[PDB]
Design a protein around this nucleic acid. Structure first.
Length: 108
DNA sequence: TGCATCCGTGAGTCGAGGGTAATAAAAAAACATCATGGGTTGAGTGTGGTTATTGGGGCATAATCGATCTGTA
């Protein structure tokens, strides 16, 4: 049965909902139809091929990282370390990185 | 020389329906041939698998402030 599902399109189905919950959350008109055509593009784009999808929050780091730099206010280095369960080295690194990032924004 | 005889000629763009029909023999055998259906090749498209990683975070080993009790005219 699992091996039967191995080549099963069940994965396709699982995805329309993955698209649904963000589209419904973002509140756009007509979830279902938008997401199915949305999937068809992926099917043609990625038909019959090995693909590494960035796994296990790697993208979510970048968004976790952006908010943290926004809440870094110069003396709360302990506060956001509890509330993200991160550590001193992590905090320092992200801080310096996003600081350079914004400095490229303010500076030409 | 006169006679009949045959052989090419003769506009131009345009439109709309546009196709119709006097008749007729059956058996048999014989053969050709395509049509479907079932089975080997074979030709794929399908799917997991080991091994090259390059940013990131991390602990060492160093370093430059911040706050108070002992020594010198």
């Amino acid at each position: 049965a699992p091996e039967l599902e191995s080549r099963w399109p069940r994965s396709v189905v699982d995805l329309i909902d993955v698209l649904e919950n963000e589209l419904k959350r973002q509140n756009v008109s007509n979830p279902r139809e938008l997401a199915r055509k949305q999937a068809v593009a992926l099917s043609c784009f990625l038909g019959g091929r090995q693909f590494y999808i960035p796994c296990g929050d790697t993208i979510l780091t970048a968004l976790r990282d952006d908010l943290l730099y926004c809440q870094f206010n110069g003396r709360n280095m302990e506060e956001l370390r509890r509330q993200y369960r991160l550590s001193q080295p992590q905090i320092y690194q992200i801080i310096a990185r996003q600081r350079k990032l914004h400095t490229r924004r303010h500076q030409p």
